[PDB]
Amino acid sequence: PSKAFETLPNIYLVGPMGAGKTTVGRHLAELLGREFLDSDHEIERKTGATIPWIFEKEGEVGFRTRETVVLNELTSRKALVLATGGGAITQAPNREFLKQRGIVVYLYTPVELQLQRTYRDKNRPLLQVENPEQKLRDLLKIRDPLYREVAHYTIETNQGAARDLAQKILQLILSNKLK
Numbered sequence: 001p002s003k004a005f006e007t008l009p010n011i012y013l014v015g016p017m018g019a020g021k022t023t024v025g026r027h028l029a030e031l032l033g034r035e036f037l038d039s040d041h042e043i044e045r046k047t048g049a050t051i052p053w054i055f056e057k058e059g060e061v062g063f064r065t066r067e068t069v070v071l072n073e074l075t076s077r078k079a080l081v082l083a084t085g086g087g088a089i090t091q092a093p094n095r096e097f098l099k100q101r102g103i104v105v106y107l108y109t110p111v112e113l114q115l116q117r118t119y120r121d122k123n124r125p126l127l128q129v130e131n132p133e134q135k136l137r138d139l140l141k142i143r144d145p146l147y148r149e150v151a152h153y154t155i156e157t158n159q160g161a162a163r164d165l166a167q168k169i170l171q172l173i174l175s176n177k178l179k
């Protein structure tokens, strides 16, 4: 049906916790008639444990080693839209897999909106802290250049229909390519 887009590369969404990666990703996949996967959810599926449990029992290092293995595998698939984890771009091998194996889109999201969308979400181990706003801010200061460097496209998002943002991303990508 949208076999029309079968030769379009994988699309990889990057950005912080609360960027709407999975809601936008799933709409973008539906628009393209292809698969959608969330690497956070795939890590949980493959491990049989939640991400808080991985962080507690294996540390952040054990989460990163599991995440890199999953990303290596998922970026080798075809016809995918992938929502990546918020800290996936902290590791050099992941930056390379993403940049070199499809189209990377950075969902730039202000801290205010990250905060609202992760409000009392206990599944985000890094935000289980007294001051989650400062944490998000600190994380963004570090990771914003990394999101931008891996990204082919950056879209400065804001409160809205995830499906409107998915449309916009698809327009951006094709704008380039159809001329």
Ligand SMILES: O=C(O)C1=C[C@@H](O)[C@@H](O)[C@H](O)C1
Residues within 6 Å of the ligand: 016, 017, 040, 051, 084, 085, 086, 087, 088, 123, 124, 125, 126
């Ligand atoms: O910002 C981060 O480093 C993380 C974001 C989440 O998507 C998970 O991938 C995990 O909680 C770590």
